[PDB]
């Protein structure tokens, strides 16, 4: 009967920037009010980019720890030293160049979306594969992407911290604490 109360934090009203967006109006989690201080479109873009980066990085860490390697003796290093070894090897610089060109295109997308020159949704790059045709299907698919991205972000955080703390491959089950 009063404020549109946030579902996540029941004692804090939902921020108006969370209306009509993916995720958002199912949980409305924003107690610190970051959406009240920054554009919701930019926050959503950053969230989706972080989710995708983490979903790739978590699986990369899993594959590297479990023993999957490229057929080169230069890659016979642990996942912890993989970054430094490959930075000194060269491929990290090339990966950075390629991610740089892709991020130049992403920056153009953001600039042309925030200025309204295009009609782009925050995280949309045009890729429409396995995307439901029905609008509710699209909304719930975007929900699934967001949930998986957030889960992978937290999971990769834990994986990196535990791997550094205990020299051990991904499952960390044995360990000692």
């Amino acid at each position: 009967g009063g404020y549109k109360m946030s579902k996540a934090v029941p004692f804090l009203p939902m921020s108006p920037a969370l209306e009509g967006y993916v995720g958002a109006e199912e949980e409305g989690f924003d107690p610190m009010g970051f959406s009240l201080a920054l554009d919701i479109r930019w926050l959503r873009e950053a969230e989706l980019k972080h989710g995708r980066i983490c979903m790739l990085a978590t699986v990369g860490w899993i594959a590297t720890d479990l023993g999957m390697r490229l057929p080169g003796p230069a890659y016979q290093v642990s996942t912890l030293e993989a970054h430094d070894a490959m930075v000194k090897f060269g491929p990290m610089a090339q990966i950075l160049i390629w991610l740089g060109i892709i991020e130049v295109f992403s920056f153009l997308a953001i600039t042309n979306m925030m200025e309204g020159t295009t009609d782009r949704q925050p995280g949309d790059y045009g890729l429409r594969r396995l995307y439901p045709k029905d609008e509710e299907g699209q909304y719930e698919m975007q929900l699934k992407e967001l949930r998986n991205g957030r889960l992978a972000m937290l999971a990769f955080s834990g994986i990196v911290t535990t791997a550094v703390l205990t020299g051990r491959t991904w499952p960390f089950x044995x360990x000692x604490x």
Binding site: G2, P10, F11, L12
Partner: protein
Amino acid sequence: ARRELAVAYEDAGIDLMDNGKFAQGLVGAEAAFGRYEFDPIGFSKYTELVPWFREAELKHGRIAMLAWLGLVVPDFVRIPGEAYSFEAVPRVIDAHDALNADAGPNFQIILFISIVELCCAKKVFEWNSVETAGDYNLTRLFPEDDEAQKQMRIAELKNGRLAMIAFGGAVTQAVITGKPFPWTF
């Protein structure tokens, strides 16, 4: 009469007027034999901060109520493990010094308490009125009638005030004695 935060929040903010009551008509003053409006230093005369002060009083009482129960239970049971055994940390008070910093236990408690506080901080400053001060929607056993709601509100405040004072003795008596739960010499 416990308006839900959903609507109660529509009358929140720094009130610039005076109710004319003791502390803007807030619970905690009614004593046993009558009223015991206490404030002798006139802190409640700064009526703009009365919702804030009540929030601080409730927050302190809630921490102290757990904290006093904190110093009691370790003296009779401890978490299953060697780091918390009665031989590694004999008395309860030597826990902030033992389990802290690089150890991990206290540091994690600091972080997750920080996360909760940084999330429930917008309720302390914004959305905090003389009506929804300390109300975090967790009203399960709250009575429905107005007068009984006042008793439970009065019950929490008196218990919180007591624990605040009781905890002060608890650490002071324990530190000067190094003794189990009854901190008498």
